[PDB]
Amino acid sequence: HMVDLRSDTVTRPGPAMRRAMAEAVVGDDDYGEDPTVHELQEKAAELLGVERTLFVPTNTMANLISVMGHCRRRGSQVLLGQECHLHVYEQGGVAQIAGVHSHPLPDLPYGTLDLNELERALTRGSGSPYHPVCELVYLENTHSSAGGRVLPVDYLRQVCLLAHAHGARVHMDGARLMNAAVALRIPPARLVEHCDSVSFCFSKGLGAPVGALVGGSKDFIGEAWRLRKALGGGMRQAGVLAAAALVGLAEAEEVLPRDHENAQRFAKGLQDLASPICSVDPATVETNMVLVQVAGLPPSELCQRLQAVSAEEVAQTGRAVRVLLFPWTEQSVRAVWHRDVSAQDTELALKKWEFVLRQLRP
Amino acid sequence: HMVDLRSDTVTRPGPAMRRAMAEAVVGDDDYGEDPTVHELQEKAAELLGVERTLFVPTNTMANLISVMGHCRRRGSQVLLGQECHLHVYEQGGVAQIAGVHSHPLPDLPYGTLDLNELERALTRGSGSPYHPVCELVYLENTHSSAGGRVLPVDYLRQVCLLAHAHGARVHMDGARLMNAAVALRIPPARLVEHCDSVSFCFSKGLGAPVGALVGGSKDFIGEAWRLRKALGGGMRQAGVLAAAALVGLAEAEEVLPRDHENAQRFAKGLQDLASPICSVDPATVETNMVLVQVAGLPPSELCQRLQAVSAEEVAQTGRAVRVLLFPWTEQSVRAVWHRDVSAQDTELALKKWEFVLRQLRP
Amino acid sequence: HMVDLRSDTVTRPGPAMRRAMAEAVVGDDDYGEDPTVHELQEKAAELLGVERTLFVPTNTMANLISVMGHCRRRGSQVLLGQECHLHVYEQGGVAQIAGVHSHPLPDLPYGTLDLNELERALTRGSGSPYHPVCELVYLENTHSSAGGRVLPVDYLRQVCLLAHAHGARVHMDGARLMNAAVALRIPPARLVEHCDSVSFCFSKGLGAPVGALVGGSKDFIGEAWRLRKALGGGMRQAGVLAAAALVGLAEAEEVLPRDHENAQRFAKGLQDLASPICSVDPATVETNMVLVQVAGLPPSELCQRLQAVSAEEVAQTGRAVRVLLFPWTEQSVRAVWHRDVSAQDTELALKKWEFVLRQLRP
Amino acid sequence: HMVDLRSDTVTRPGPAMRRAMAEAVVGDDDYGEDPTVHELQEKAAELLGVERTLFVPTNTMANLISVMGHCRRRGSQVLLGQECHLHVYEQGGVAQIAGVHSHPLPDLPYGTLDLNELERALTRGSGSPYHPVCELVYLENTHSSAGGRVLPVDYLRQVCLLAHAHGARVHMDGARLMNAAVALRIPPARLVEHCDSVSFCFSKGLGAPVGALVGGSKDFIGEAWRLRKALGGGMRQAGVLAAAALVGLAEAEEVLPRDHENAQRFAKGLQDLASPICSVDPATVETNMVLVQVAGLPPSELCQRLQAVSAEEVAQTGRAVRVLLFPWTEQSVRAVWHRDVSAQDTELALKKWEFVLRQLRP
Ligand code: NA
Ligand code: NA
Ligand code: NA
Ligand code: NA
């Protein structure tokens, strides 16, 4: 048995998705003739509260397009977080493709930026021609590096007021925006109301194989077409991929709560072990991610034992569970849940954790 | 009835493709865990005679990655054709994304570059620190703007000898490389032997919904991984798309000849009309493209009548055929054939052409 | 003795210039406090018929700033000549710094672009989102690679009408704009009336050691300040350099005619030699440049003998004149006159030419 | 009377400089024919312990060239300080011109980077293909935003050891490197030994009108020639500017100590006032900069009164001193000394400060 808790991208297509792709009325998206792409775009337009949307291959390109479509002035700056995906895990494309300066701000605890330091950054070069013009504030809901932490609607409101005052636009990396709205029990459009543009991934928690989109005003999405074309994302018969995305877009309000519940149950069960090696605050688990603090054991070696299977595991637990994880920081590991991790898989991992912890118990 | 001859991109998935997508063993390609992507990559590596390949969303990104991975020096130049796809229909991404200077050379007749002007250009900045360092010679086989003209193997050899002498690499835009190998009756690797890297489109004549790849040495493809990731093409479960691509890769050497025959038959049938309005030399038709010279009628109005249907069309011909075409030059229109145009569709178009020409015969 | 006819950049400061630099009321140009910079900027503003000007280190940066300030849209194109300085001798900075696509057009004979091919290029992507947006037409008066050929006021008018129709701006590389206006006997502002922006070099024919400027509307020059700052041209006490430039700006209408007369006299004297090796049409000499066609002798080797001095030269001519030149094409060499070449130096070179030609006379 | 303490850039040419410019043996530096440029370059090479140097218009271009010549890989990162000049006051040219990602680290107190956060950053993407390749560590000696704080030789050594271990190069922004070497009483080459490249400004404390240079190995400076040419800094007769630079380079080890003494004396005199409004620790004054902490008064209004002159100022002090200063932070102002501020000017400022403080003493 294998429980892959490394990321929510490993979701494989389900039966409904696989048929939807093969039963998809397709066309040339470059000519604007794929109806299944057109459906996904307009369904997500109402879901996200934006005028238009634009299907893109990845959410990485979705962010790259947004930065390029907002930060167009030569000498423009984006205000972003120090541990957001755009700054860390996107090859620095803000500079090597967009040519836009980045001023990162701290946000590690709760995925939020200090609105005082935001005001300080938005005002330092508010008019001076000696400083780059900050034209975009980049937010991440949920924040992946912080542990899937939800950004409150109130924090979203304040950021925009501060940004829109100093003449800057607001984009939200909504790679896990459905996870945030599921946790807050609010419609997803209430989080995007306080934004100019948004990104949205289908390949993560929703279960789709490939797909993402940019959302915003009709003009911003119209300018986004040329940027998607130039970056290499002008696919032809992409209604094959939009069909599976439409299925997961409809199954979000029933699949994602299960991943949050499995995350909470795991965090509780791991806390009920009281081990000096591993510590988890079940209240930090806001969505489908559990950040486990490891002490005394290198996070890489803990993952190695959770993935390994020994005869003694079959002695105490009875099963052979290979728990797959990623070491996140130097003292922590990250587990992420999805629709392909069952609730009994969650219990199987907890028992694998029990065995592993006891073997390395101080 | 409707015959879409605007481009070979409008190829829609067949039943075998649609089943292959839904029956695909998929995984996270970003982690290198999609086996169907690995299969398509390894099959095309042997087909093209390259060490490795890399599945990308479009051939536009495949070309962009090749330029970026070859023209890396600050102050680098690419030698390309004046009417090649990279120079005209890719939003100038060689400059706005790659930051690479372009020196275009004429290529309109046969898709070939004058080896004298190439040698002169390769020598002007061979050592001078006042000129950019030419690091890539960009070729297009087949050449789309010229009418799918095939580049001879000997011409390919000479270009490399001239380039490899002055320390430049050779990339071939093989968006229609399978069409070239079918016309030349040679395996595709014999055209790529005289290259460092190559591009290869699946979404055109091969019938796939989405997909392309970059080919070359293992080192070049390893550098291509970061460029695909940074440009936004690092998809996750892309074995869904690779599965349909594998079907078209196996059906190419039997589907594309039918498209060449339909193109030749159409050009002949148009030549057997002897009309002063339209003229086509059936010897210029080397592949699946027919460049029709228009006289007396603006090329846009010819396309409008071929798509339109009138009561008199049902009087003279008996059917209602909507032939879809794109005006190409100021005095010509471009027709491109694919697997979704049947041989009787070609005859239906020829009859629609007859009617249109006869109404405005002067 | 030495007559350097390689370029007009080798002009060394005169006595009036050297005192003007040492007697210059200077200040911090970055703070806008250098009055000698302010004087040169406003004097050139009236001279060129522009609202404002901006002193820059080189004319290379002046062009780079103009392209950046006009071609600001992501996916913008500049229409320029194939043998203009921006395309050939500026390290392809239109792409590697500005990130702007370049569509070069032929202009070799008279430095003019075929207005039909200009219309064709300005219309091909006039609205299509598949093509880059042409936002700048780049002209060169005089054209250096063509042999200092003057662009007529009428040709300037037509280009602008064609450009301003399709919503593009016009910049003129006026590195030798005073040479053009001196030849046409018109004030320099009459050539810039048909332009949006202009460049202007002081280090060439005017005699200054360092300096250039960008001219245009007050907004374009205000946006140019940030671009000059970012590229590294925000000098501090540059009134030292502006003072020498103001001297040459006042001495242009008395120094430059002498360089044109010496060029014509040389071309005549060389034509009155009737040598099969060298040929010069004295009517192609429009300004201070003479393009000498060489046949039977590699242009590099002719320059080597003109620079060399032998005992036999002292036998036939009596003097030891080292004529310094540049081989320009594969069958031509380029001579350029300036204020540091005297009229007797011109006669000394012609005699050195006589001797050299006779030694290699077929 | 007027004391300009806003920056050390306002240094105006002295008589020896003004004579040196007018007595300069100049030539075309682009052809490598300006001997005075060659002299300044060779003298600074021995002074800084580098193989070669390259005269550039500004130190902004010198830094831009260094970043471009080090951070050349597509997907490269520079490790720099959060308040360093490259990150704040250079229009983000690291991205909008160089296309290089920036990971800034805190440095506000002592201008030093936390070697733990540096090691952590140098290891996060030491091999991972998901992270940009860190190729340059950027240091600033002295650190301008921190108040001219000197970086110790030992701290410089450790940074290189950490960088050279993880395969990164070290560049030092030596805009005020002579101020650092005067404070440390060491030859300047001992600070540059722990570097690959360095920058060096002449227009600041040294007194020159215009000029700076890049230093490093012969190969790095050879690559710097094309970058200086492409950015627009390839001047012709720059021995005019190099001549004045040679004067300040020889007068540095006797002029800069006077500026350090005036800064210390001022800070002491301000400390001997014991005012609740303004506070300065004279031990933070390491060079020619005094960071004055302001309380109760917005820093802008303090500068307005120090520049203003009233009848009561002539009543209490007897003179009319206009002290020119820049508000630096939200609670501080920055004073910088240079050769054009005399020791009695410092006493006149201190008396102007006394008056201003006493009027608003609470
Ligand atoms: Na997925
Ligand atoms: Na297709
Ligand atoms: Na000069
Ligand atoms: Na100065």
Residue numbers in the entry:
A (entry chain B), B (entry chain A), C (entry chain B), D (entry chain A): 39 to 400
Provide excerpts from the study.
However, a mouse protein absent in humans (threonine aldolase; Tha1) catalyzes the reaction more efficiently. However, the preferred substrate of Tha1 is HTML with a catalytic efficiency in the order of 104 s−1 M−1, followed by L-allo-threonine (102 s−1 M−1) and L-threonine (101 s−1 M−1). As we found that the mouse enzyme has a strong preference (1000 folds) for HTML towards threonine, the name hydroxytrimethyllysine aldolase (Htmla) would be a better descriptor of the mouse gene.
Mouse Tha1 crystallizes in two space groups, in orthorhombic F222 and in monoclinic C2, with one molecule and two molecules in the ASU, respectively. In Tha1, the PLP cofactor, bound to Lys242, is stabilized in the active site by a network of hydrogen bonds and salt bridges with the side chains of Asp211, Arg214 and Thr98 from the same unit, and of Lys267 and Arg274 from the adjacent unit. His123 is making an aromatic stacking interaction with the PLP pyridine ring with a relative distance between the rings of 3.7 Å. The RMSD values between the single units (around 0.26–0.28 Å) indicate that the monoclinic and orthorhombic structures are similar. As indicate by data from PISA analysis, the interface between units A and B (analogous to that between units C and D, termed “main interface”) is contributing stronger to the stability of the quaternary structure in comparison with the interface between units A and C (analogous to that between units B and D, termed “secondary interface”). Hence, the tetramer can be considered a dimer (AB + CD) of dimers (A + B and C + D), with the first dissociation being ABCD to AB + CD (as determined by PISA). As a consequence, the tetrameric assembly of the mouse enzyme has a lower stability, with a ΔGdiss (the free energy of assembly dissociation) value of 5–6 kcal/mol compared to the 40.9 kcal/mol of the bacterial enzyme (for the ABCD to AB + CD dissociation).
